[PDB]
Amino acid sequence: VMILFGPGEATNVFQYETVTIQITPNIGSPLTISQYIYQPDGKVTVIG
Amino acid sequence: LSLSGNVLYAVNYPTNTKSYWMYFTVSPSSGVSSVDLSPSTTAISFTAA
């Protein structure tokens, strides 16, 4: 699953913040993903 | 919350007849989640038993 940010959500980096993603298929329980994001530490960072 | 500094105590030194303040530092434990510290919701108790 990959999320690409547009110019709205891209505007400044997530820091000291909780990000929640939820995937809700048409049958069965949704998957809810939550991370508190510290300052990102590389070009890619492991947040959760 | 974790205690995340030393506890400092101030008095009328050297005479030591009177007590002024205590100072210490706290932070949310192990960086896991945020803590509400509003003085309406939170209590701080003090006991010298």
From TrEMBL, chain A:
Q: Which domain of life is it from?
A: Archaea
Q: Where is the signal peptide?
A: none
The protein's location, in the record's own words, is: Archaeal flagellum
Q: Which family does it belong to?
A: Belongs to the archaeal flagellin family.
What this chain does, per the record? Flagellin is the subunit protein which polymerizes to form the filaments of archaeal flagella.
This protein's name: Flagellin
Which organism does this sequence originate in?
Sulfolobus acidocaldarius (strain ATCC 33909 / DSM 639 / JCM 8929 / NBRC 15157 / NCIMB 11770)
Its lineage opens with: Archaea, Thermoproteota, Thermoprotei, Sulfolobales, Sulfolobaceae
Portion of the parent chain present: 257 to 304 of 304
